[PDB]
Amino acid sequence: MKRFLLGLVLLLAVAAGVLYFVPATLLASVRTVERGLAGLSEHSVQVDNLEIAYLEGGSEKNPTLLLIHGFGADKDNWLRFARPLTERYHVVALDLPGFGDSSKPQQASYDVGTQAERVANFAAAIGVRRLHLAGNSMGGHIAALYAARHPEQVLSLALIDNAGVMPARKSELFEDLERGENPLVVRQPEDFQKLLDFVFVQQPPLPAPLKRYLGERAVAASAFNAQIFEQLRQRYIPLEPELPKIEAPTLLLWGDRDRVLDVSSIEVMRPLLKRPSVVIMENCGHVPMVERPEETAQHYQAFLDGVRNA
Ligand SMILES: CCCCCCCCO[C@@H]1O[C@H](CO)[C@@H](O)[C@H](O)[C@H]1O
Ligand SMILES: CCCCCCCCCCCCCC(=O)O
Numbered sequence: 001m002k003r004f005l006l007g008l009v010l011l012l013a014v015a016a017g018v019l020y021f022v023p024a025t026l027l028a029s030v031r032t033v034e035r036g037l038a039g040l041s042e043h044s045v046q047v048d049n050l051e052i053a054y055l056e057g058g059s060e061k062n063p064t065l066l067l068i069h070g071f072g073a074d075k076d077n078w079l080r081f082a083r084p085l086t087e088r089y090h091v092v093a094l095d096l097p098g099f100g101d102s103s104k105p106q107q108a109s110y111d112v113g114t115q116a117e118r119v120a121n122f123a124a125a126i127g128v129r130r131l132h133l134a135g136n137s138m139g140g141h142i143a144a145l146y147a148a149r150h151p152e153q154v155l156s157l158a159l160i161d162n163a164g165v166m167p168a169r170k171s172e173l174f175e176d177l178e179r180g181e182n183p184l185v186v187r188q189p190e191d192f193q194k195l196l197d198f199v200f201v202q203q204p205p206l207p208a209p210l211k212r213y214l215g216e217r218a219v220a221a222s223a224f225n226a227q228i229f230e231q232l233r234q235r236y237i238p239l240e241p242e243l244p245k246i247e248a249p250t251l252l253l254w255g256d257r258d259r260v261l262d263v264s265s266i267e268v269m270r271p272l273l274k275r276p277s278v279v280i281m282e283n284c285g286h287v288p289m290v291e292r293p294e295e296t297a298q299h300y301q302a303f304l305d306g307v308r309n310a
Contacts, residue, residue: 023213030210034079039086040093044101047122053101054094054126055079058086063155064128067093068119070137070163070287071232072184072218072225074100077136080293084301089132094122096139098228110228111235112138112164116145123153132304133248134158136287137261138232144239144246151247156307158251158300159269161286163232164239167264172198184260185226186218199286201257243272251277251303255284255291277303 035041040057055075065085069077075093082091095102097118098110108114119142123131132155135143140162147154176182183191183198192215196203206214243250250273254263263280270276279299281288288296 023209023216026210027213031076034076038079038083038091040079040082040091045122045125047118047125050097050103050105050118052094052097052103052118052122052125054092054122055082056090056092056126057082058088058090060090062088062090064090064092064131066119066123066128066131066133067091068133068135068139068143069093069096069099070135070139071229072099072186072221073136073139076100077287077290081289081297081300084294084297088301092126092128094119096142098224104224109235110231111237112141112145112232113235113237116142116149119143119146120150120153129153130155132156132158132307134160134300135162136160136289138163140164141237141239145237145242147248147250148242148245151245154246154248156251156304157246157248158253158303160253160289160296161255161258161261162239162265163261164237165265165268166238166240167262167268169262169264171262172259173261182226182229185222185229186215187222189215189219191215192218198259200291201255201283201285202291204291240268240272243269244274246273249275249277249303249307251279251300253279253288253296253299254281255286255288256280256282257284258286260286277306279303 040055042055044051044053067078069075075095078093085091096115098104130153133143133146140159141164143157144159144162144164147157183195186192186195252266252269254266256263266278284291
């Protein structure tokens with residue numbers, strides 16, 4: 001019957017629009033708003049034949065800040081943090097290979113050592129020779145290695161709840177791992193809210209339709225993310241022997257109630273760094289630059305002012 005088929009067309013039309021098209025445009029609209037408010041726009045560049053997506057803003061005449069997201073995250077983690085920075089800095093935030101909109105070759109290495117070399121190659125690819133680095137979690141682990149390996153390029157380093165040391169207190173993540181639980185890998189749609197609860201003390205407001213799509217995207221990425229996470233475990237590079245090689249002023253910034261990586265990490269790193277600064281934000285979780293962006297950016301600007309002003 002023509003009507004049964006016609007009705008079949010509309011039913012699929014509405015379903016395809018509801019299930020696929022509306023969520024995607026929703027994400028594109030929110031990205032448009034948050035990137036636009038931060039003065040950031042998206043580009044891509046091929047680095048060792050991998051497509052690396054990145055955001056860029058501010059004047060190229062100003063010093064470059066290169067921002068590196070953590071495990072399972074992407075460059076949009078940095079939008080609200082970057083907003084007060086693009087007035088005075090050339091801000092760049094990339095998607096690491098394996099994440100976001102960048103290439104994800106199935107057979108590549110995604111250890112932080114290999115990733116740190118890709119980031120250095122990326123900086124050269126966009127014509128940046130001297131820069132400030134900031135990295136969160138896995139991205140901080142990577143940023144620290146970049147700074148240790150290429151001291152001539154790095155003007156300052158900000159480690160925002162970075163991975164890479166073994167502190168006195170075992171974090172809730174590392175506790176979870178002993179029982180085969182990893183909140184950072186979202187297997188089921190309900191585990192996405194669990195991930196947010198795990199990394200935020202006070203979670204920023206998130207519209208329900210946007211949240212569900214983010215959760216769907218996280219589930220779709222979970223198998224590959226789990227494989228990368230296994231490489232981060234098996235190909236782990238301790239920072240303790242590397243930190244003394246860093247010449248740059250280094251900011252250690254933590255959320256005091258970080259459940260993923262413990263604040264006692266700072267006591268490991270501080271004695272090992274030539275020029276450490278410290279900020280511990282109160283009642284804050286693992287991603288201060290997302291949870292309290294303007295506050296975190298203000299601490300970072302203060303740090304940068306000191307680095308420049310003397
Ligand atoms: C919880 C993890 C971080 C969430 C980031 C929220 C991104 C979208 O957040 C929404 O954006 C709107 C316009 O930009 C705001 O006006 C809304 O209040 C906010 O819910
Ligand atoms: C512009 C809309 C993008 C929405 C961003 C949602 C925030 C993602 C939460 C992940 C936080 C980082 C987790 C980690 O570093 O381990």
